[PDB]
Amino acid sequence: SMVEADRPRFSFSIAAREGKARTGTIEMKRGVIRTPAFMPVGTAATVKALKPETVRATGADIILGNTYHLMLRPGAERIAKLGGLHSFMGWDRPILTDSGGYQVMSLSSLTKQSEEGVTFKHMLSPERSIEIQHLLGSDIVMAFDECTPYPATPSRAASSMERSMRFAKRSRDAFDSRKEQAENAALFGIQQGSVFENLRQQSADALAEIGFDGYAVGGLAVGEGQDEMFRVLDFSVPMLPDDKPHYLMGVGKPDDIVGAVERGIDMFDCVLPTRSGRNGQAFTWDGPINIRNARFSEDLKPLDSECHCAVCQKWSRAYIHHLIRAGEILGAMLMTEHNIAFYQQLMQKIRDSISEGRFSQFAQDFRARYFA
Amino acid sequence: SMVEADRPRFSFSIAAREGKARTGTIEMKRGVIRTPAFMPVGTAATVKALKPETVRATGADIILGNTYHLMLRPGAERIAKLGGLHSFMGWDRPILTDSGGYQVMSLSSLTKQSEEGVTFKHMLSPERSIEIQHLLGSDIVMAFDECTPYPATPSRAASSMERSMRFAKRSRDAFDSRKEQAENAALFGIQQGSVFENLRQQSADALAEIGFDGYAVGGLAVGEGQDEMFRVLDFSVPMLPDDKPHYLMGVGKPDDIVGAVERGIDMFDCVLPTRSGRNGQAFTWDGPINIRNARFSEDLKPLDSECHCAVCQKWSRAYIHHLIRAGEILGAMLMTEHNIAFYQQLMQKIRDSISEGRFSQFAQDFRARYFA
Ligand SMILES: [Cl-]
Numbered sequence: 001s002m003v004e005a006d007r008p009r010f011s012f013s014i015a016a017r018e019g020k021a022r023t024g025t026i027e028m029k030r031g032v033i034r035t036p037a038f039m040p041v042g043t044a045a046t047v048k049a050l051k052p053e054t055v056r057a058t059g060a061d062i063i064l065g066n067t068y069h070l071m072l073r074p075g076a077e078r079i080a081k082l083g084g085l086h087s088f089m090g091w092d093r094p095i096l097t098d099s100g101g102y103q104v105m106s107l108s109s110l111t112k113q114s115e116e117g118v119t120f121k122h123m124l125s126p127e128r129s130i131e132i133q134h135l136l137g138s139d140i141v142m143a144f145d146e147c148t149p150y151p152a153t154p155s156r157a158a159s160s161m162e163r164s165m166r167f168a169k170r171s172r173d174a175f176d177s178r179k180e181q182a183e184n185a186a187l188f189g190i191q192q193g194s195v196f197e198n199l200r201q202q203s204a205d206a207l208a209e210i211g212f213d214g215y216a217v218g219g220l221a222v223g224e225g226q227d228e229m230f231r232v233l234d235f236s237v238p239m240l241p242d243d244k245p246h247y248l249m250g251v252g253k254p255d256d257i258v259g260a261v262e263r264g265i266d267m268f269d270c271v272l273p274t275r276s277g278r279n280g281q282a283f284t285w286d287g288p289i290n291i292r293n294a295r296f297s298e299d300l301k302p303l304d305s306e307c308h309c310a311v312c313q314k315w316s317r318a319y320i321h322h323l324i325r326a327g328e329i330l331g332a333m334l335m336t337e338h339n340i341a342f343y344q345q346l347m348q349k350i351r352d353s354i355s356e357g358r359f360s361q362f363a364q365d366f367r368a369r370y371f372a
Numbered sequence: 373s374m375v376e377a378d379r380p381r382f383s384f385s386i387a388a389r390e391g392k393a394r395t396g397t398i399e400m401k402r403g404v405i406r407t408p409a410f411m412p413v414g415t416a417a418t419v420k421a422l423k424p425e426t427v428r429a430t431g432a433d434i435i436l437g438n439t440y441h442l443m444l445r446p447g448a449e450r451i452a453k454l455g456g457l458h459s460f461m462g463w464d465r466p467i468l469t470d471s472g473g474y475q476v477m478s479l480s481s482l483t484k485q486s487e488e489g490v491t492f493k494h495m496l497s498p499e500r501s502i503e504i505q506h507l508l509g510s511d512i513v514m515a516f517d518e519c520t521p522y523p524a525t526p527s528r529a530a531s532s533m534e535r536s537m538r539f540a541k542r543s544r545d546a547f548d549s550r551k552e553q554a555e556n557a558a559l560f561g562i563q564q565g566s567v568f569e570n571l572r573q574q575s576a577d578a579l580a581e582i583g584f585d586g587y588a589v590g591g592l593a594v595g596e597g598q599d600e601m602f603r604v605l606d607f608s609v610p611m612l613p614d615d616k617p618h619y620l621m622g623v624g625k626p627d628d629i630v631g632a633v634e635r636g637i638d639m640f641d642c643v644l645p646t647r648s649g650r651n652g653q654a655f656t657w658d659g660p661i662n663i664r665n666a667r668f669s670e671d672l673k674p675l676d677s678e679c680h681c682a683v684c685q686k687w688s689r690a691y692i693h694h695l696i697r698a699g700e701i702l703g704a705m706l707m708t709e710h711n712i713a714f715y716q717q718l719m720q721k722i723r724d725s726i727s728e729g730r731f732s733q734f735a736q737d738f739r740a741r742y743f744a
Pocket residue numbers: 041043048271274275
């Protein structure tokens with residue numbers, strides 16, 4: 001039919017649910033994102049040790065671009081002059097960018113947080129963060145906020161949450177005031193409040209009044225331990241709008257992801273598969289292994305016995321053990337490809353199990369084997 | 373026809389000639405090698421920063437496996453137990469292995485050369501070198517010799533050449549005494565004699581009396597300068613059997629290769645494209661460039677304007693400049709793939725021009741542009 005014969009800026013659809021868990025899609029102009037989603041991290045315009053085509057071969061639909069490094073070198077204006085981050089690095093699908101503020105605090109010197117933003121050895125305000133993300137050509141822009149250390153007293157957590165909510169409104173208005181950005185990208189707000197239910201509620205209410213395309217749970221990748229993280233998620237995720245994506249920033253280990261999905265999270269990112277891969281840790285369905293251990297020196301099996309990735313089709317543990325011990329670049333490449341593929345296969349199993357109404361059983365089976 | 377409906381152990385055929393230059397093929401059980409050939413170097417069971425499929429995509433028909441690192445770690449017996457070097461690293465085509473002796477002298481400590489071979493901090497005799505190369509599963513085995521430093525006095529050059537010829541006979545007999553090796557691999561002898569015509573002649577005569585599948589010109593990648601290298605090649609290559617391959621070990625820069633082919637060399641290896649690629653040097657038809665230079669920070673052109681490699685199809689100088697300056701693994705990967713592809717495209721242009729009787733013109737055109 002003629003009538004049957006482009007993607008929207010942003011459309012999140014939920015296809016299936018089981019308990020608090022959801023599966024569906026985010027459609028954007030640069031592609032579809034299957035949820036729950038894992039985003040590999042690109043630290044300085046590269047997912048370390050992988051060509052973009054290899055990232056895509058693992059199943060990733062979207063990557064996270066750290067802003068902090070790029071705003072320093074090559075610089076946001078320079079990247080824009082060169083055609084934007086997508087062209088520059090050769091990834092044509094969606095990119096979510098962080099605001100830059102957290103890595104300023106973790107990596108910079110002589111930092112000072114204030115109502116104007118953060119200065120460091122350079123000023124990064126909410127408005128400038130949104131502009132930088134625009135210049136990079138981000139598809140999902142994160143509101144600029146003020147981080148809360150862990151542990152935090154109730155007073156400190158309230159102060160940084162309140163400032164973050166003022167910054168969320170400033171971020172909203174800056175994004176909306178740039179027509180090309182408002183029409184082509186999406187903006188996510190970040191819930192704060194440390195581990196305190198009342199502050200988490202105040203933050204969710206403030207963000208919902210402003211209105212965002214998605215809602216992150218901030219402040220939980222900070223050393224609190226899984227029991228506490230899950231306790232906070234238990235009350236925090238229900239506070240967010242149900243019909244928008246829920247993004248748990250900086251999480252995490254495979255079992256963290258499974259439990260967070262059980263609590264209503266749709267999106268994840270962390271450096272664990274890439275960074276710990278380069279350090280010799282490989283993820284397997286039977287738990288992580290450190291490939292440098294002497295027990296692998298003559299092990300002809302692949303990293304994981306079921307994994308479908310190209311690394312596991314072609315190379316042995318023994319070979320990868322040799323490469324990592326020798327400091328060879330190919331060792332980093334192979335470990336990273338496998339680990340990112342493992343994470344994507346985890347997400348696929350999560351999505352399929354929710355779609356089939358058997359996610360609770362999947363989670364129990366996953367844990368029993370992973371922690372055996 | 374029924375009558376028309378495996379490859380030999382070794383068959384070198386010359387399809388075309390121009391002056392002293394030749395083009396043709398070496399057929400072996402694991403594949404065909406197009407000559408003149410460039411062999412990427414695999415230092416520790418990896419061509420640094422490349423999967424084998426990427427090495428093959430550049431056009432390489434054969435790689436060089438350094439023996440020295442592998443005989444120490446993982447060890448030759450261990451590699452054999454794991455199925456041999458080809459299986460271990462995932463390269464199923466021919467591998468030429470060096471003897472290990474030169475890298476003992478260049479990288480080891482407390483070395484001592486004698487009529488038994490070389491001891492170091494471990495003994496490596498001619499017989500043990502051949503055995504190690506067997507355990508790795510080498511397709512082209514290099515005779516074990518004794519290197520000559522540059523400069524060398526006539527007396528020293530004669531002594532090491534004479535010992536090398538005694539070691540060449542020992543290598544021949546060791547190779548022949550191992551039936552599986554003799555039937556499936558090839559053995560090359562190495563001409564020595566430093567820069568001295570009379571010693572080069574004595575060495576060629578000794579090697580021809582023993583008999584080898586191919587003949588290397590040893591001792592010329594040692595700092596002597598191109599004029600002197602070419603002068604020695606002028607008289608040395610004609611001394612070798614015409615109907616066998618001529619291998620110039622450790623050479624070299626693009627213009628070294630062109631001039632060596634003009635003097636009758638069929639095979640080459642060096643670390644320049646890989647090692648200097650990781651250091652930021654990219655080869656182009658207009659000469660080498662250092663991609664770290666600030667002049668490339670906003671240059672959207674590919675590394676080379678004509679190169680057919682995947683790197684030049686997909687990424688800019690500006691991006692690769694950023695990666696190398698940032699110390700990113702992907703920078704090493706992309707520089708290395710391009711440089712090895714450039715070397716293979718050089719070899720292809722050499723082969724085609726000899727096949728078409730226009731190699732002299734190619735060499736003159738190549739130099740005029742490369743040194744402009
Ligand atoms: Cl990383």
